From a paper:
Myophage Mu is a representative of contractile nanomachines with a simple tail baseplate. It has the capacity to infect a range of intestinal bacteria and has extensive applications in genetic engineering research. Using cryo-EM, we resolved the three-dimensional (3D) structures of the G(+) type phage Mu in both its extended state and urea-induced contracted state, the latter lacking the baseplate, at near-atomic resolutions. The structure of extended Mu can be divided into four distinct regions: the DNA-containing head, the connector complex, the tail, and the baseplate.
Numbering used by the authors:
A (entry chain U): 3 to 304, 322 to 388
B (entry chain T): 221 to 293
C (entry chain V): 148 to 220
D (entry chain V): 294 to 304, 322 to 388
E (entry chain T): 75 to 147
């Protein structure tokens, strides 16, 4: 039996938990769009439900926001590209033995040789907006070595938090208690932007309101622009007019454009009344305020703060990788028990690039000693 | 929130219609439907006894709301 | 054995498998499309956003500003 | 400006990151689709899965020859 | 939220080290360095520090302790 990281023995099954016939029904889902006609009460109810462990409506709302809002998508893409551009290397523990160094370098070489690692990291970046990111693991054989063939992303809406114990995710199976996650078969990465339980640490909680304000303002602005700068044309006719005479007047009113002429009797009158007036200053002011609020929420400014954000979420991702992927590989490949405090980890190249021009000052220091 | 509510009802004056006291019940329905069908470059014919007017339900600027928001921020 | 030439194909002639998303198939007026012929296609997809295929393109976010700009102009 | 922000990321470093990301994706697609079949059809023996060549793009920032004159003192020091 | 996140990221970015008292003995230095190595080797320390940063907005921060054994320690 394979020994867990916590020290509790268990049985390892290569088949996915989602491949079960009974679970096949819940796998197929229709992606509802709760962003149509958003109401502050509706958003508050969705957030309240997500607090208790629903996590479905909030996930769909976050998906809708990440595609409907251009600024939010741009900022998220910028952040994910910034985190993805870093370089990583596997290093063993301090004062490591020769065998430990050999294992560390072989794992490092394998992970640079693994194609699915980049996709796995990119998919794990989804926990910046959503509260969590869940990916399957497809175990396989490569030269008598247990390695993952590929990792499959899963919809965040298919997971619910345990009411008895929060901060623990479970697979939804239409039951009071969801199915426990299959050990050595999942890669769960969560980003704790704010302290608290899972499902409340995502960026959706703070970004729901500016999105609503900005979208409503822009749609109202577009509607106002539609009926702007074209006054309505009206025609007054005497009470004794024939039914046919009204039709001719109605057709004549509809035929006004460019440099138009026309003759009207003394009894009839024609006037122009504007159906909309105002300026675009307030709509644009609100849109700009919402956009800068979103930019402040995501990036921290409208740089050093970007570097700190990258360091923090890179460290969180490294901890998640060490907890989820590094240990099972060694545990399955090695027959003996894996030491808990002597396992290799992943270190990202989080170092500021030096300036070769200003490091010429080291020569006098080297001469002095 | 007050600024958003003000923006909701801004730059679109209310359309009203006056009808004579002798109008039929059906005639009021047609006028009500006609008032609701105003948009873009709209036309229309109105009798001498009836009148149509536009009244703005909200006016002002966004300067005070933004000033208060900036001070609070 | 080398490829003589590569011919681009219309993206509208492909449909995703309802049983298993993220997999493209050639449309043949059937519930399940024809599976791609091995060693006969060059399929490149750009994952701008995580999720299933057909939702990771730039169309999803760029549809709205295009509509607003064109209607305004 | 919204469209420009969506496509290019700004209205530069971000352009470089976008180029690196989509170049890497295209390189992975090329390695998966075109590199393997050529070797598989040309070679009679089975092709090793973990020992096949790939494509690498020249994703390196151009250096400044004026500022690299500082390497001479470092070379002298060791 | 943005300001609180900025402050917490600023405080979290610092580096720490365990040091003994002044004029420490050899055993005191050994204990200090072993505790320092263990705390860098402890994964929960970063999460504990991040959660303890909640006392900037709230008046206090309370966290449980789950004692255990690691090599008879």
């Amino acid at each position: 039996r394979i020994l867990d990281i916590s020290g509790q023995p268990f049985d390892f099954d290569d088949e996915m938990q989602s491949r079960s016939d009974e679970l096949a029904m819940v796998m197929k889902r229709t992606q509802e769009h709760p962003s149509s006609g958003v109401t502050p009460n509706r958003a508050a109810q969705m957030l309240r439900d997500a607090e208790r462990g629903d996590l479905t409506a909030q996930a769909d709302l976050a998906f809708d926001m990440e595609e409907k809002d251009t600024h939010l998508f741009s900022e998220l893409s910028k952040r994910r590209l910034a985190i993805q551009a870093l370089e990583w290397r596997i290093a063993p523990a301090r004062d490591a033995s020769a065998q430990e160094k050999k294992d560390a370098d072989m794992l490092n070489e394998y992970l640079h040789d693994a194609a699915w690692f980049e996709d796995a990291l990119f998919d794990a970046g989804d926990a910046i907006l959503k509260g969590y990111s869940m990916q399957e693991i497809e175990w396989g054989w490569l030269g008598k070595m247990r390695v993952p063939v590929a990792l499959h992303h899963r919809d965040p809406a298919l997971f619910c938090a345990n009411p008895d114990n929060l901060n623990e995710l479970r697979l939804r199976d239409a039951s009071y208690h969801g199915l426990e996650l299959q050990p050595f078969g999942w890669f769960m990465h969560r980003a704790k932007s704010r302290t608290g339980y899972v499902g409340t640490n995502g960026l959706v909680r703070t970004l729901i309101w500016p999105f609503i304000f900005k979208n409503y303002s822009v749609r109202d602005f577009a509607e106002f622009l539609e009926i702007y700068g074209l006054p309505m044309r009206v025609g007054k006719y005497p009470t004794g007019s024939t039914n046919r005479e009204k039709a001719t007047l109605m057709q004549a009113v509809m035929d006004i454009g460019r440099r138009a002429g026309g003759i009207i009797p003394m009894g009839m009158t024609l006037d122009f009344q504007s159906a909309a007036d105002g300026q675009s200053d307030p709509f644009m002011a609100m849109i700009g305020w919402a956009e800068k609020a979103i930019s402040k929420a995501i990036l921290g400014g409208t740089d050093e703060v970007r570097r700190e954000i990258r360091n923090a979420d890179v460290g969180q991702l490294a901890r998640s990788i060490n907890r989820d992927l590094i240990y099972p590989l060694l545990a399955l490949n090695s027959d003996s028990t894996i030491d808990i405090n002597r396992l290799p980890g992943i270190v990202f190249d989080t170092s500021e690039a030096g300036d070769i021009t200003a490091l010429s000052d080291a020569i006098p220091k080297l001469a002095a000693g």
